[PDB]
Every structure is written in structure tokens, then in C-alpha cells.
Swiss-Prot record:
Source species taxonomy: Viruses, Riboviria, Orthornavirae, Pisuviricota, Pisoniviricetes
Activation/inhibition comment: Inhibited in vitro by GRL-0617.
Places the protein is found: Host endoplasmic reticulum membrane
Residues of the full protein shown: 1025 to 1191 of 7096
Subunit structure: May form homohexamers. Interacts with N protein.
Naturally occurring in which organism (per UniProt): Severe acute respiratory syndrome coronavirus 2
Outcome recorded upon mutating S164L: In strain: Gamma/P.1
Protein name: Papain-like protease nsp3
The reaction(s) this protein catalyses: Thiol-dependent hydrolysis of ester, thioester, amide, peptide and isopeptide bonds formed by the C-terminal Gly of ubiquitin (a 76-residue protein attached to proteins as an intracellular targeting signal)
């Protein structure tokens, strides 16, 4: 039993809810919140910009030190950093950005990072400003993640389409 409430169950291990991942994180305080990161951990917009703003820029400060030490992530890769006031940890995961020409096949690799964590609160990878089809992102999620994932979809119209079209 966990504290996530109001989700629609899609599969044994994948759940979905129309919610702002920021407000969901502040309420649940999950062990892991997933950020839709880029390779530079520049949290300027989208989910990343929203999560970072909610940390009063502490996420960005921590991320800049991480990059200065370690260099950029790989597309499809991840790193674990602090969750600040939102969660114990933040798993920064880089899905391919279609508006940069990156191989959509890397979306499966991106979701594989979730399997290193028993429970996660997460967005749909490569959706929104990353340019991929969110219906496709959801399919890859369900077919790749085996741990328990609670998906927050900010757009209500997108949420209803994802549910109604799910096979
Ligand atoms: C990868 C990527 C980039 C850009 C945009 C999105 C969309 C996709 C959608 O609508 O779910 N989601 C969000 O931006 C989002 N999701 C949950 N909680 C949130 N809080 C504030 C914003 C926000 C996704």
C-alpha cells in the first residue's frame, strides 16, 4: 500500500492520473520523482522548468555542480540527484527530443532507467516540448517499465485521449 490516490490503473504496474506532477510531488513526497531532463541538466522549461521552479532553483544549482564534475548525460541515460522539497530523490531521465532530431528508439532505453527504482512518480518521457507522440510514450512505458510507476499527465485533454486510446 502507498499514498498515491485517484489514479486509473492501466496494467499490473502502470497507473495514470490527470495531475500537475509538481503538485502531486508536494503532496505525496515520493521516494523518487522523475524529471524530463536534457543532457545538460538545464531545467529551463517543460516539466524540468516546473520542478526546478518549485525547488526555488536549488535543483539547477545542484545540477550545475553535477555537470561541472561529470559532464553531460547520454540521451537515454539518467542520474539520481536530490529531490529537494519534492521527494527524497529526483531521477533525471533524458528521453530523445524529436525537435533535436534524436532517435525515438532511445525512448525505450530512457524508460529502462525506471526499473532501478521500485516506485516512481513520473511524466511521460519525450512528450510535450520534447516532441514525441504521448500515446507512443505511454505504450513504450507500459512495455518497458516493470516497477510501479505513477504517471502524471498535466493536460486534461491529453489525459482523456491517453485513457480512451489505451490498448
Ligand atoms: C516531457 C514533457 C515536456 C514538456 C511538457 C510535457 C507535458 C506533457 C503532459 O501534458 O503531461 N507535461 C508537463 O509539462 C507536466 N507534467 C506533469 N506535471 C507538470 N507540472 C508542470 C508541468 C507538468 C512533458
Amino acid at each position: 500500500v502507498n499514498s498515491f490516490s485517484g489514479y486509473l490503473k492501466l496494467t499490473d504496474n502502470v497507473y495514470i492520473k490527470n495531475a500537475d506532477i509538481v503538485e502531486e510531488a508536494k503532496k505525496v513526497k515520493p521516494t523518487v520523482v522523475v524529471n524530463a531532463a536534457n543532457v545538460y541538466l538545464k531545467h529551463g522549461g517543460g516539466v524540468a522548468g516546473a520542478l526546478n521552479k518549485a525547488t526555488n532553483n536549488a535543483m539547477q544549482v545542484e545540477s550545475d555542480d553535477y555537470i561541472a564534475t561529470n559532464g553531460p548525460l547520454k540521451v537515454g541515460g539518467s542520474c539520481v540527484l536530490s529531490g529537494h522539497n519534492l521527494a527524497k530523490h529526483c531521477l533525471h531521465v533524458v528521453g530523445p527530443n524529436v525537435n533535436k532530431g534524436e532517435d525515438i528508439q532511445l525512448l525505450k532505453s530512457a524508460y529502462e532507467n525506471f526499473n532501478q527504482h521500485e516506485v516512481l512518480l513520473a511524466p511521460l518521457l519525450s512528450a510535450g516540448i520534447f516532441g514525441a507522440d504521448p500515446i507512443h510514450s505511454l505504450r513504450v512505458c507500459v512495455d518497458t517499465v516493470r516497477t510501479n510507476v505513477y504517471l502524471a499527465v498535466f493536460d486534461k485533454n491529453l489525459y482523456d485521449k491517453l485513457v480512451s486510446s489505451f490498448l
